Design a protein around this ligand. Structure first.
Ligand code: COA
Ligand code: COA
Lengths: 152, 152
């Protein structure tokens, strides 16, 4: 069978996606231990406010997005709760083809169905590609900020 | 009575502080309507996770701080929940005297007693004075980021 190509599926990560997801995520956060990633998957799966999305193509995972629902203050946002995009990543060899586009779309649709008026997100200044992408997908830059931590 | 000066009290904003607080806050967020500020005071007062602190000096309000407890992800933080410093402001004519220092201290002590391992905060790049202050009070700059919003 050849006149076509071979479909891509954006699916919500359930437990049978845990290794595909872990595999891609190790490349978004190289520095976060396999154990850590596993812990996270468990947490995500079970939580009402956490969701992930995997973009499967011909039985393999080529991109994912990590969304959460924020009930706290959220830089540049007017309403609550907010659908935040915590992490999105598409295998190099599949970028600029609308994958992250669909992934982000499925993170919006999830957050809409969960009450969220706005889909927030964030990126690093050194991340120009990320910055552009956000703009291309209709995200408006709201504010830039510096964060601090102090132990209690 | 003269050999001394005249004590300053950092107190947690209850309802009999609502106009002193509103008065100072109008100068942190000029652009937020008196109505809005009032709404906020009500909300703060009643919520388990919201707290404010007023620095009273000789019966008048000279500085305040707005803290919240964050249960969502928090840029540059390792634990949850986090005591976030949403807003701090000290009348011009009282800065550089340790007021914000005590105010921030009382926001830490509140957030400690509420489980928080870390006290987070944030500021704008154009805010050099804020930036310095944070450093002086032992806050380490964790990360800088750009935020985005998209409607759902
Ligand atoms: C951000 C990232 C997920 C984008 O993936 P993607 O597959 O390239 O996304 P899309 O192809 O759907 O791009 C959507 C839009 O961004 C633009 N864009 C994508 N890649 C771009 C690039 N590398 N440089 C400039 N513009 C780019 C597309 O042209 C545009 O399409 P449009 O014609 O509808 O405007 C990224 O490439 C990634 O996979 N790697 C690093 C992870 C990262 O940056 N994370 C961000 C938050 S954690
Ligand atoms: C940030 C602000 C609250 C500081 O108030 P403050 O009364 O001056 O704070 P403190 O005097 O307790 O200062 C603590 C430390 O910061 C330093 N500092 C204070 N003001 C400073 C200034 N104007 N320039 C440089 N360093 C400064 C103090 O020297 C230092 O004391 P230390 O000897 O213990 O290191 C500010 O001045 C304010 O009131 N106005 C604008 C509001 C704002 O910037 N908000 C920030 C987050 S919403």
């Amino acid at each position: 069978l050849v006149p076509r190509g071979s479909h891509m599926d954006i699916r919500q990560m359930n437990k049978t996606h845990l290794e595909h997801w872990r595999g891609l995520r190790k490349q978004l956060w190289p520095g976060h231990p396999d154990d850590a990633h596993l812990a996270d998957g468990e947490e995500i799966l079970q939580a009402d406010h956490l969701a992930s999305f995997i973009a499967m193509a011909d039985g393999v995972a080529i991109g994912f997005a990590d969304a959460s629902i924020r009930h706290d203050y959220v830089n540049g946002c007017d309403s609550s709760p907010v659908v935040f995009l915590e992490g999105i990543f598409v295998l190099p060899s599949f970028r600029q083809r609308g994958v992250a586009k669909q992934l982000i779309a499925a993170v919006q649709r999830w957050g809409t169905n969960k009450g969220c008026r706005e889909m927030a997100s964030d990126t690093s200044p050194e991340n120009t590609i990320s910055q552009k992408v956000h703009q291309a997908l209709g995200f408006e830059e709201t504010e830039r900020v510096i964060f601090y931590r102090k132990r209690c």
